[PDB]
Every structure is written in C-alpha cells, then in structure tokens.
Amino acid sequence: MKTILRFVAGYDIASHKKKTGGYPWERGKA
C-alpha cells in the first residue's frame, strides 16, 4: 500500500531502542 510504511515502521522501534543522531531520514546535510 505504501513502501514508506516499511520506513516509519522502524522509527516506532528506534524510539524505544535508542536515539542518537538527529533525524530518521536526515542524518546530515545530504
């Protein structure tokens, strides 16, 4: 239905696991 789902599906898991970098898609300038 939405390939993007597979992406966000990980965020919900990263929020509990650990967070240290910035953004789920924006790791840096590029």
UniProtKB/TrEMBL annotation:
Recorded source organism is Lactococcus lactis subsp. lactis (Streptococcus lactis)
* Annotated keywords: Plasmid
Q: What is this protein called?
A: LsbB
